[PDB]
Design a protein around this motif. Structure first.
Motif, PDB file in Angstrom:
ATOM      1  N   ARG A   1      -2.845  -4.178   1.470  1.00  0.00           N
ATOM      2  CA  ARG A   1      -3.929  -4.310   0.507  1.00  0.00           C
ATOM      3  C   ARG A   1      -3.919  -3.110  -0.428  1.00  0.00           C
ATOM      4  O   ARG A   1      -3.735  -1.973   0.011  1.00  0.00           O
ATOM      5  N   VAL A   2      -4.116  -3.376  -1.716  1.00  0.00           N
ATOM      6  CA  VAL A   2      -4.144  -2.330  -2.735  1.00  0.00           C
ATOM      7  C   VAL A   2      -5.438  -2.467  -3.528  1.00  0.00           C
ATOM      8  O   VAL A   2      -5.445  -3.081  -4.605  1.00  0.00           O
ATOM      9  N   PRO A   3      -6.554  -1.924  -3.036  1.00  0.00           N
ATOM     10  CA  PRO A   3      -7.823  -2.047  -3.769  1.00  0.00           C
ATOM     11  C   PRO A   3      -7.891  -1.124  -4.976  1.00  0.00           C
ATOM     12  O   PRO A   3      -8.431  -0.016  -4.894  1.00  0.00           O
ATOM     13  N   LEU A   4      -7.336  -1.572  -6.103  1.00  0.00           N
ATOM     14  CA  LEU A   4      -7.311  -0.749  -7.306  1.00  0.00           C
ATOM     15  C   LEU A   4      -8.695  -0.541  -7.907  1.00  0.00           C
ATOM     16  O   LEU A   4      -8.912   0.465  -8.593  1.00  0.00           O
TER      17      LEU A   4
ATOM     18  N   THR B   1     -11.751  -0.219  -6.278  1.00  0.00           N
ATOM     19  CA  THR B   1     -12.634   0.687  -5.558  1.00  0.00           C
ATOM     20  C   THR B   1     -12.318   2.131  -5.930  1.00  0.00           C
ATOM     21  O   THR B   1     -11.185   2.466  -6.289  1.00  0.00           O
ATOM     22  N   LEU B   2     -13.341   2.986  -5.866  1.00  0.00           N
ATOM     23  CA  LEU B   2     -13.206   4.400  -6.190  1.00  0.00           C
ATOM     24  C   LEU B   2     -13.447   5.295  -4.980  1.00  0.00           C
ATOM     25  O   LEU B   2     -13.889   6.439  -5.131  1.00  0.00           O
ATOM     26  N   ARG B   3     -13.161   4.797  -3.781  1.00  0.00           N
ATOM     27  CA  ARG B   3     -13.358   5.546  -2.543  1.00  0.00           C
ATOM     28  C   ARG B   3     -12.129   5.383  -1.650  1.00  0.00           C
ATOM     29  O   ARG B   3     -12.226   5.141  -0.447  1.00  0.00           O
ATOM     30  N   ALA B   4     -10.945   5.510  -2.245  1.00  0.00           N
ATOM     31  CA  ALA B   4      -9.701   5.350  -1.509  1.00  0.00           C
ATOM     32  C   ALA B   4      -8.593   6.118  -2.214  1.00  0.00           C
ATOM     33  O   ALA B   4      -8.676   6.376  -3.418  1.00  0.00           O
ATOM     34  N   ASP B   5      -7.561   6.483  -1.454  1.00  0.00           N
ATOM     35  CA  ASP B   5      -6.404   7.170  -2.014  1.00  0.00           C
ATOM     36  C   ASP B   5      -5.465   6.177  -2.689  1.00  0.00           C
ATOM     37  O   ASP B   5      -4.796   5.384  -2.018  1.00  0.00           O
ATOM     38  N   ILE B   6      -5.407   6.219  -4.017  1.00  0.00           N
ATOM     39  CA  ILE B   6      -4.614   5.277  -4.799  1.00  0.00           C
ATOM     40  C   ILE B   6      -3.540   6.050  -5.553  1.00  0.00           C
ATOM     41  O   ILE B   6      -3.249   5.753  -6.718  1.00  0.00           O
ATOM     42  N   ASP B   7      -2.988   7.081  -4.910  1.00  0.00           N
ATOM     43  CA  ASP B   7      -1.946   7.927  -5.485  1.00  0.00           C
ATOM     44  C   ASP B   7      -0.893   7.094  -6.203  1.00  0.00           C
ATOM     45  O   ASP B   7      -0.266   6.212  -5.607  1.00  0.00           O
ATOM     46  N   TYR B   8      -0.706   7.372  -7.492  1.00  0.00           N
ATOM     47  CA  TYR B   8       0.133   6.555  -8.358  1.00  0.00           C
ATOM     48  C   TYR B   8       0.925   7.450  -9.298  1.00  0.00           C
ATOM     49  O   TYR B   8       0.393   8.423  -9.838  1.00  0.00           O
ATOM     50  N   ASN B   9       2.198   7.110  -9.491  1.00  0.00           N
ATOM     51  CA  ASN B   9       3.075   7.871 -10.371  1.00  0.00           C
ATOM     52  C   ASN B   9       4.076   6.915 -11.003  1.00  0.00           C
ATOM     53  O   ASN B   9       4.303   5.806 -10.513  1.00  0.00           O
TER      54      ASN B   9
END
Ligand SMILES: [Mg+2]
Ligand SMILES: [Mg+2]
Ligand SMILES: [Mg+2]
Ligand SMILES: [Mg+2]
Ligand SMILES: [Mg+2]
Ligand SMILES: [Mg+2]
Ligand SMILES: [Mg+2]
Ligand SMILES: [Mg+2]
Ligand SMILES: [Mg+2]
Ligand SMILES: [Mg+2]
Ligand SMILES: [Mg+2]
Ligand SMILES: [Mg+2]
Ligand SMILES: [Mg+2]
Ligand SMILES: [Mg+2]
Ligand SMILES: [Mg+2]
Ligand SMILES: [Mg+2]
Ligand SMILES: [Mg+2]
Ligand SMILES: [Mg+2]
Ligand SMILES: [Mg+2]
Ligand SMILES: [Mg+2]
Ligand SMILES: [Mg+2]
Ligand SMILES: [Mg+2]
Ligand SMILES: [Mg+2]
Length: 212
Positions: free
Chosen positions: A171-174, A176-184
């Motif tokens: 799951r990738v909850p893009l 939500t603002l309460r999760a680590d969504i480290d992106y590069n």
RNA sequence: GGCGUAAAGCGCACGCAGGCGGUUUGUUAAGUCAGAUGUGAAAUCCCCGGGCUCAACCUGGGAACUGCAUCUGAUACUGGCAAGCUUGAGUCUCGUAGAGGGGGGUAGAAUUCCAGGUGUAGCGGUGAAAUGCGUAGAGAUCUGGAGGAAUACCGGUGGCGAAGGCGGCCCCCUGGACGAAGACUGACGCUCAGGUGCGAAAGCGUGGGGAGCAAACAGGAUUAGAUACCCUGGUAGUCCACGCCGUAAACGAUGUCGACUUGGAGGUUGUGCCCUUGAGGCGUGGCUUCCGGAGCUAACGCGUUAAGUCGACCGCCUGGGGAGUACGGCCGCAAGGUUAAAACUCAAAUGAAUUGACGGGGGCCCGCACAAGCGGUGGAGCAUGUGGUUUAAUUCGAUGCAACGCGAAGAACCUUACCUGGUCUUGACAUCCACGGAAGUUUUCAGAGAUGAGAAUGUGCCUUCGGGAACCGUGAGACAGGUGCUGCAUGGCUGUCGUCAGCUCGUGUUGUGAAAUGUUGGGUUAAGUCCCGCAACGAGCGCAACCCUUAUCCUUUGUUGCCAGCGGUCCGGCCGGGAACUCAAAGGAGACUGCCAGUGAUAAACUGGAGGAAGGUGGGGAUGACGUCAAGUCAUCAUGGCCCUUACGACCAGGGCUACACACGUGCUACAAUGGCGCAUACAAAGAGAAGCGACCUCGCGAGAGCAAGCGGACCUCAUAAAGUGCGUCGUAGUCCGGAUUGGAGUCUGCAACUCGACUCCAUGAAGUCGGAAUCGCUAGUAAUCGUGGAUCAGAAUGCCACGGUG
RNA sequence: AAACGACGAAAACUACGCUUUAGCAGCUUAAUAACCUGCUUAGAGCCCUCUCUCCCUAGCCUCCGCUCUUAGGACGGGGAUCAAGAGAGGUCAAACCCAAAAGAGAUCGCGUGGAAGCCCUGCCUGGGGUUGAAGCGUUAAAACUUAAUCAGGCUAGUUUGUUAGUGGCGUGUCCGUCCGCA
């Protein structure tokens, strides 16, 4: 445009900054010019080394760049000579004396920048994008990441018309603002143009916000 | 192999030849079955061996030549013959229903005409109109008469009939079907190439009839055209009798008969028995409808009336067009029918179903999308961008909603690419180099400058000193360079559907299969939000929440922010002082359908309310899925080829992006008495400030000028906010309305505002006097109306981005 | 117009590498397995490095810069090397962490009394003001002190105005009787 950058939407909530300092815009422009110069110099130099990220602090009349990398030994060198070699150039570029820190990153296949890296190298050495992305996502899922999403676009496999393929696991909850969504991001310079790669790695739900 | 839908059941019925044929006995043994004989040439194939050095090739024997004729037997089956039997078939005796057929009469409704009476200005028709009927009396009403067709309700997935087809009633003749019980006739039984007969309507001939309807035709109407759909008339025809063709989606797209193979709900019509207390029940027949199990089918679907498994017979099909066309034979008065090809072209032509999309198809729902407003746009100048025009350039890109106050958050040279002029060939911008000098600091001339010369000069810090940073000049070579193009190669970024609510996956299940369930259906909603039900069970991207601002309260700490209480005063927060408050910025509490009633399916959910600053997301922002638009950028940047290296590259001066006849788009000023004008006078918030904001004094009618203190900023400035409020003044006016145009002279910033900023004075005073079709945004502190700050910026907003006042 | 997509059956970046167990997890009817696994516990045999275990020395500094300087320290330099071993790591320079003081007053900086200019003033005599210009001394001292002199040859007598002998281009070219600046 469809998606906003997931880092600067939660930088103020759960994600840390890549540059920590203060200015009264008397020197803000030159400070970021210096930060850009040192970042690009480090990226150009440590090509073989898998650099994870570059954080910069700028105290009074001094700087401290804390490079995070997966394989620190190449940058370190024997008896810590290479770091001393590459510290003086950074110090003289930034003016004030520098003190470079190096941090080893555990689980090198779970970092967004690291997983976005070396896939461009595989594409350059002509490794099939589909199998490369599948191996990357399966390794990231096996290591412990709760969700991985990999997109590759542009002249895939040296075809005639560019497209956009993508794989996703967990799951990738893009939103939500309460999760680590480290992106590069990363790009590959092949023989028939440039290929864009994006990776989203959801690790967990960081309850409580910043500062754990 | 097939004929319900791809090609394939004659429209139906009768029937000759022919094909097949219930059951028992005896007989014959023709077919059939067994054995034997002759023949079935040699050659050839096959099998076993041999010869050519192997093989090809030759050769010996065997088998085979699947056939025919004769003889000797077998008798189950078929066939011939003779006897039997009733279960197939046909008939009698009695009732039953039926738009079954032919012929003749009779009764009303209704339409149309004729004659008469009453009666006056319309009748008819269409989405609307007119052709048409009307003052010669229309339409309407009533009376009598004339003539034609069919018989409202009964009337039904009802009945009859081989099919076509058949609907008032009565009579006459007649065909067919079914049932209760009874006896014989004894295979007489089914199908059918030719042949015959019947055969919807349309059509033709003769002799009549003709009320209504209606081809052809006449007129009106819509439309660019309408030889049509619509309207007003109207001939053949539709009607009768005898004749002619034999065509139909003649359809159940399913040829006739026999028996076998689960059920339910009926319809019609007999018949046996039961207490027939109701259309009470138990059985048995004939016809027919719907659903459906097994089975069948490519699927739809058929499914005891099979499209399930067979038996007997006939017809038809062999790719789509050409074509059921021409020729040819037959029929026919004719129209035409029947039998029925060939040459040539094509890679398909097809049917059942699946997922999208569309419908001038249906159902439900949402959004300022309409409806109820409000204000504007289009009218006339003013500030902008686009198209075309002209020029050397008016640099390039964006070209529907999603382009036109766009990139450009701001062009005198800079930016700037385009043009006119001049210069450079390793270059303006890097790396490799051989040298000579560190550089560099003032400067003279030519020149519009780019760069051509000329000088006083600096003689900077570094080891063994052919030195190194580092700076320039000469000579090249790779190279540098492009805002040159290709967003129809792209990366990255962005707009649109749309902040719509949908988009998918794993497993399971269903169908061979594309695929479907899950995601539909019932409530509910802002919503795939929830619940229920259900071959569905769960999850992901998603609709919400977490994130930012604000709406109330508590606590922590009071300067530059405040004065509940006191003292003095220079009456001012002035400062001693006071840390409750207004406020500052950190953490919490707080709104969670929580509760109380009603409603609902005992839910979900909805309506009202005791409380609260708050009520169903409290009010706003960020957050923009799968994907569509070869959507926009190769001129932010990067990137694959292609293009130039004496030029598309490099430097400088002057012009152009801001332009002569126009159109379009987005804003501003307004139109006036809701108003402008002169003099007092309060109420805000958010931001900026270091070669920058800039207090005070003085000159200024003025933009401002000398002087400048404070301020890296809760301290000081930008910056007495306007609307309003007080008083007069203007009286509906070429206006004390609009400040657009134009002339004179200046103020600030900028080497330099003529092309090309703005502010200030004097005067001049264009339009306009509420704006045509067609349009734009907004449902609450929202639309309007007023002012201010800020972004890039030497200066330049009527634009952009935000605070507020009123509302 | 056009637009399909089959093999890390090229485990291919190499973490020192290679081991057993300990439990979670995918695998499943169900408990093992092959492992798909990221760790956690244990031993290092070992390819490797570092402090090392040698000796001498007391090498030990740290507050005040430096001078024998005190409580105390985890504090400390040279040289060739190993048999085995006590700990850290794996191509680890700092960071996170653990710490600094009693000194004494010996000195460059740092502060000095009769001296070089600048003030009517341009050349200058200008002390009247002053320092590292001359005696002098420690975190301190024998202290101590950068403008205000009038007036002079002072743009020098023919420069300003009485005033001309010619050491003069004068006047498109001008020989040029004369006019015109000194
Ligand atoms: Mg077939
Ligand atoms: Mg057919
Ligand atoms: Mg067909
Ligand atoms: Mg038929
Ligand atoms: Mg026929
Ligand atoms: Mg015989
Ligand atoms: Mg025989
Ligand atoms: Mg032989
Ligand atoms: Mg033979
Ligand atoms: Mg017989
Ligand atoms: Mg009868
Ligand atoms: Mg026949
Ligand atoms: Mg007829
Ligand atoms: Mg008619
Ligand atoms: Mg008609
Ligand atoms: Mg006739
Ligand atoms: Mg026919
Ligand atoms: Mg038929
Ligand atoms: Mg028959
Ligand atoms: Mg019948
Ligand atoms: Mg059925
Ligand atoms: Mg014909
Ligand atoms: Mg329509």
């Amino acid at each position: 445009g469809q998606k906003v950058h997931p880092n600067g939407i939660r930088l103020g909530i759960v994600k840390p900054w890549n540059s920590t300092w203060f200015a009264n815009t008397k020197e803000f422009a030159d400070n970021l010019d210096s930060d850009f110069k040192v970042r690009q110099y480090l990226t150009k130099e440590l090509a073989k080394a898998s650099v994870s990220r570059i954080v910069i602090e700028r105290p009074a009349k001094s700087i401290r760049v804390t490079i995070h990398t997966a394989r620190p030994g190449i940058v370190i060198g024997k008896k810590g000579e290479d770091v001393e070699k590459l510290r003086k150039v950074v110090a003289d570029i930034a003016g004030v004396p520098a003190q470079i820190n190096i941090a080893e990153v555990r689980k090198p296949e779970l970092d967004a920048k690291l997983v976005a890296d070396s896939i461009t190298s595989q594409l350059e050495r002509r490794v099939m994008f589909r199998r490369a992305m599948k191996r990357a996502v399966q390794n990231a899922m096996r290591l412990g990441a709760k969700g991985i999403k990999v997109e590759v676009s542009g002249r895939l496999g040296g075809a005639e018309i560019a497209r956009t393929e993508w794989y996703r696991e967990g799951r990738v909850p893009l939103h939500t603002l309460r999760a680590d969504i480290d992106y590069n991001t990363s790009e590959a310079h092949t023989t028939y143009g440039v290929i864009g790669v994006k990776v989203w790695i959801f690790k967990g739900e960081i309850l409580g916000g910043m500062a754990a």
